[PDB]
Amino acid sequence: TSWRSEATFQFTVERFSRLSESVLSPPCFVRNLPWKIMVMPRFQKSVGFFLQCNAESDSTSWSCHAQAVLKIINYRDDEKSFSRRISHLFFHKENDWGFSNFMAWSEVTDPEKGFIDDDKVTFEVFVQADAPHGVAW
């Protein structure tokens, strides 16, 4: 159920080499809150990859601490997938967290590396969140 304390979800960015604006994945519910993958080009140059939480809510009283593993899937060999971990207290003023320079744009888009296929790159997040505060009183 959505009240689960953790989950793993993926989002495949298409026409990746042409990415020019920030993109958002559909939500994955954990602790009944919507979590989304956020991807964006940063400085071509680097791939920005962040985890977002409950960003559309108007509430300013919520907070949810969580740890997560952000990974870009290598479709040829999982062991070659690149990941980084985060630990963050998500709340309305800091509703997303990750790396603006998760990895080199030239590397991810390199056809010989195995991260991109048919100009698509799959992002994955394994999030483990604690019970939130200021949400379900």
Partner: peptide
């Protein structure tokens, strides 16, 4: 790499 918000 240091983490941060977007």
């Amino acid at each position: 790499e240091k983490p941060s918000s977007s």
